Design a protein around this ligand. Structure first.
Ligand code: FAD
Ligand code: CL
Length: 413
C-alpha cells in the first residue's frame, strides 16, 4: 500500500494551494494530490466569460502545469475514505495511506435535479456560468437576445460564490442598454432566498441598483423545470407551497443546485448533511485528528469562495505545523471571505466580511460603492495573483494588507 506523509484530495484551488505549502514543510516527495481532471480553472473568470468580457481559454491551464514541482499527481478519483485506518480508495483500484489528510474536493453541481437538464442546454437561449460546458452558451444567449424575458435563477441549496448568479444579471442588463435592447428586455431574478445578499451594507447597495435599473426580483422563487424546446421555465413558490408558474424566456441563466461531492455524502468524515466536519477555527476534523478540510467541501459556516480558500490556507498551514510539533493550535480562522460583485462592465462592489457577517473591508475607501478600481483589480490583477501567488503558496488573504492600510489611516485619521 502506497503511503504519503501528506495526502491531498482534489486538485482545485484549495488542493493545489495546500500541496504547495505542505511541500515546504515536509518535502515535495512526501506530498501527493489525487485529481482526475486534466484541466485546472480559475472559476471566477467564468462570470466575465458568460458576459463576453473574457475568453474561456484564459481561465484554464493544464493540471500538469500547476502541480507543484516534485509532487506526485495521482491522476484518479477518490472512491472511498477509510479514516479509521488512515487509507483511501481510488477508481484505479489503488489504496493509499496517509499520516495527514487534506480534503479539498470542492462543491458538486447537480443540473439533473432540474427537469429536464442538462439535456435542455442543447437548445439555444439557455446557459449557465457554473459549468465549462455551458458558460459560453450564456454569452451566446446574451448576444442573440432579441425581445422577451431574461431570467436568472438561484437554487434552494448551498452554492459557491453566492454573488455570481446576480453578477451576470447586472452584466446582461448593462449589455441590453449598451446595444439598444433594454426597452425589449424584461429582466427577472428568481431566487430561493429571501434576501438579495447576506450582509446588510452590501445588500442595501445592491438594492439601490435593483430599483434604479428596474430589475424584477422575486424572492422565495425556485426553478424546478426547464422546457427548453418550448423555451419555458417552471418556478415553484417557496412562499406559498403548491403554487407554480410557467414563464417564457428569451434568455435563461441557470444556477444549478449544489451539494457535497457524492464520495463525501455518506463518508465517515461527513457531518449529518455530507460536508466535511471540521473545526470552525482550526479547520482540523472534529473526529479524526489527522484529517483536515478546506474549501467548498467543508462545513465552515461562511461563503464558499476562492477568497475564503486563500484565508483558510494560511490558517490550515499553521494548524498542521503546530500539530506536527504536538502543540495546540492557537490562531483562529475568522471566516474571512469576499464576493467581487460585478455590477457593470467596469464596476465592482467588493464585499468582504467574516463569520459574524460584518464587513471586513481591506481598503480604506467604502467598498459598498461601485468602483472602477475594484473592477480593474478583479479583472486584470487577481488572475495573476491566483496563478503565480496562491497556487504557489504565497497568498493567505489580505489580512496583512488590511492592517497596514488601517495603520496609514491612523497616520492620517
Ligand atoms: C462562476 C463562478 C464565479 C466565481 N467567482 C468567484 C469570485 O469572484 N471570487 C471568489 O472568491 N470565488 C469565486 N468563485 C468560487 C470559487 O471558484 C470556488 O469557491 C473555489 O474554486 C473553491 O475551491 P475548492 O478547492 O474548494 O474547489 P475547486 O477549486 O472546485 O476544487 C475541486 C476539485 O476537486 C476535484 N474532485 C472532485 N471530486 C473528486 C473526487 N472524487 N476525487 C478527486 N478529486 C475530485 C475536482 O476535479 C476539482 O479539481 C466562483 C465560482 C463560480 C462557479
Ligand atoms: Cl500566509
Amino acid at each position: 500500500m502506497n503511503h504519503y506523509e501528506v495526502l491531498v484530495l482534489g486538485g482545485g484551488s484549495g488542493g493545489i494551494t495546500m500541496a504547495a505549502r505542505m511541500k515546504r514543510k515536509v518535502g515535495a516527495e512526501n506530498v501527493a494530490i489525487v485529481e482526475p481532471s486534466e484541466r485546472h480553472f480559475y472559476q471566477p473568470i467564468w462570470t466575465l466569460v458568460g458576459a463576453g468580457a473574457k475568453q474561456l481559454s484564459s481561465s484554464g491551464r493544464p493540471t500538469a502545469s500547476v502541480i507543484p514541482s516534485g509532487v506526485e499527481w495521482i491522476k484518479a478519483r477518490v472512491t472511498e475514505l477509510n479514516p479509521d485506518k488512515n487509507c483511501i480508495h481510488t477508481d484505479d483500484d489503488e489504496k493509499i495511506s496517509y499520516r495527514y489528510l487534506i480534503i479539498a474536493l470542492g462543491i458538486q453541481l447537480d443540473y439533473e435535479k432540474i427537469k429536464g437538464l442538462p439535456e435542455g442546454f442543447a437548445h439555444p437561449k439557455i446557459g449557465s456560468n457554473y459549468s465549462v460546458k455551458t458558460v459560453e452558451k450564456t454569452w451566446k444567449a446574451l448576444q442573440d437576445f432579441k425581445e422577451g424575458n431574461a431570467i436568472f435563477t438561484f437554487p434552494n441549496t448551498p452554492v459557491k460564490c453566492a454573488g455570481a448568479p446576480q453578477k451576470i444579471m447586472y452584466l446582461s442588463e448593462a449589455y441590453f442598454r449598451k446595444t439598444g435592447k433594454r426597452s425589449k428586455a424584461n429582466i427577472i431574478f428568481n431566487t430561493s432566498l429571501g434576501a438579495i445578499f447576506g450582509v446588510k451594507k452590501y445588500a442595501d447597495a445592491l438594492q439601490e441598483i435593483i430599483q434604479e435599473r428596474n430589475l424584477t426580483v422575486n424572492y422565495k422563487k425556485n426553478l424546478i423545470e426547464v422546457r427548453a424546446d418550448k423555451q419555458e421555465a417552471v418556478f415553484e413558490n417557496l412562499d406559498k407551497p403548491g403554487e407554480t408558474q410557467v414563464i417564457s424566456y428569451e434568455m435563461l441563466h441557470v444556477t444549478p443546485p449544489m451539494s457535497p461531492p457524492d464520495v463525501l455524502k455518506t463518508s465517515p468524515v461527513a457531518d449529518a448533511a455530507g460536508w466535511v466536519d471540521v473545526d470552525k477555527e482550526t479547520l482540523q476534523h472534529r473526529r479524526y485528528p489527522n484529517v483536515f478540510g478546506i474549501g467548498d467541501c467543508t462545513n465552515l459556516p461562511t461563503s464558499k469562495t476562492a477568497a475564503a480558500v486563500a484565508a483558510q490556507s494560511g490558517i490550515l498551514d499553521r494548524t498542521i505545523s503546530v500539530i506536527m510539533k504536538n502543540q495546540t493550535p492557537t490562531k483562529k480562522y475568522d471566516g474571512y471571505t469576499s464576493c467581487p460583485l460585478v455590477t457593470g462592465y467596469n464596476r465592482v462592489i467588493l464585499a468582504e466580511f467574516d463569520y459574524k457577517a460584518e464587513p471586513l473591508e481591506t481598503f480604506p475607501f467604502d467598498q459598498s460603492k461601485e468602483r472602477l478600481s475594484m473592477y480593474l483589480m478583479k479583472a486584470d490583477l487577481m488572475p495573476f495573483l491566483y496563478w503565480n501567488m496562491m497556487l504557489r503558496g504565497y497568498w493567505g488573504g489580505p489580512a496583512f494588507l488590511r492592517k497596514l492600510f488601517h495603520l496609514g489611516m491612523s497616520l492620517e485619521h
